[PDB]
Design a protein around this ligand. Structure first.
Ligand SMILES: Oc1ccc2cn[nH]c2c1
Ligand SMILES: Oc1ccc2cn[nH]c2c1
Ligand SMILES: [Cl-]
Lengths: 208, 208
């Protein structure tokens, strides 16, 4: 029921760079993950303009941020277009092989890690703060699946018989023991205002 | 053989804002149009990773910038994924109705016109410098078409029996009589280095 996979060599390389490189401005992870959800929401909005029944699986387009101090997680939920099984396998629907290449050689021209969005592999900045990332996704054209990794050079894909969700994607960050400041009402507020104030969709910060 | 269309009200509104608003930093148009081609190239790269025959219509992924002083044009060419007829009609494959809304109210929160990319309607900044824009496009799943507008609240779509191009999109800017500095070898070089130095694809500046 659980399939295990090896990251392509270039992505494994990137993930190891992100975990090991001394770099203080970790807060950008949220900008990047919010930005990816906004892009998924654009995609089902475009699609629905021609066939309005794509929105049958949930008529609202939004982003939610859910801190939990017990499980030491922060969840980012969107009701975007979602990913198909094959999407999950193909580096979470990105061009990671070529994107990592362009990024790696952009650190040759003096650029720093905050520029990771510009290359299209910004999802992996989640490894600035998380020790394990579980992505749950449901796309109209397929079933619900769960993807999971703690780096190490491999990820798993199972089908998910937990919570039906209708449509979208959930990125559960299981945070590193020294990064719990990103569970703080105050601190998430500041980061959302600094780096994400003009996102076209409503962002609800949940309270505990 | 030539169909004429009315822009939706919100897009007409935006275009009129871009043409009339006093605003000096016009140079961003190139950043935005380059950025859109990069996004089209990402899309056929993603597609080709699963079915490699999508690249049968041209194996190279690149951007070219072509100044012409005679016809007073600057052409930006990419061999991206291209647009289908319906794409051309739907605001050049963008979410323009909602995007213009989010943008218009972002000028309520102090943001300026250079932030147009963040809302997904950056193609229209071309109206900072061009008086007429002709877009030529060929997508694997359809024929070659030509879209054209001088604003005025309407655009045309004809099928194009000029140059076969295989796959991609060409954005011909017919420049305003006072914006010919964007035909200068020197000046295009500076703008590409300032705002576009980390684009993952090769950009060839043609010389005349
Ligand atoms: O951070 C991410 C990464 C991938 C997807 C797909 N949908 N939403 C996402 C968010
Ligand atoms: O500036 C643009 C706008 C739309 C498309 C589509 N493909 N390439 C483009 C460039
Ligand atoms: Cl983008």
């Amino acid at each position: 029921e659980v399939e295990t996979f090896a990251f392509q060599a270039e992505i494994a390389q990137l993930m190891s760079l992100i975990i090991n490189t001394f770099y203080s401005n970790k807060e950008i992870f949220l900008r990047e993950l919010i930005s990816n959800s906004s892009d998924a929401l654009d995609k089902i909005r475009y699609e629905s303009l021609t066939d309005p029944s794509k929105l049958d699986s949930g008529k609202e387009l939004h982003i939610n941020l859910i801190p939990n101090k017990q499980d030491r997680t922060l969840t980012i939920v969107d009701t975007g277009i979602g990913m198909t099984k094959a999407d999950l396998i193909n580096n979470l629907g990105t061009i990671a092989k070529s994107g990592t290449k362009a990024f790696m050689e952009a650190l040759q021209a003096g650029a720093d890690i905050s520029m990771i969005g510009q290359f299209g592999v910004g999802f992996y900045s989640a490894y600035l703060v998380a020790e394990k990332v579980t992505v749950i996704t449901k796309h109209n054209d397929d079933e619900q699946y769960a993807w999971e990794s703690s780096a190490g050079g491999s990820f798993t894909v199972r089908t998910d018989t937990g919570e039906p969700m209708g449509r979208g994607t959930k990125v559960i960050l299981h945070l590193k023991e020294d990064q719990t400041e990103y569970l703080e009402e105050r601190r998430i507020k500041e980061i959302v205002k600094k780096h994400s104030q003009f996102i076209g969709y409503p962002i609800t910060l949940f309270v505990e």
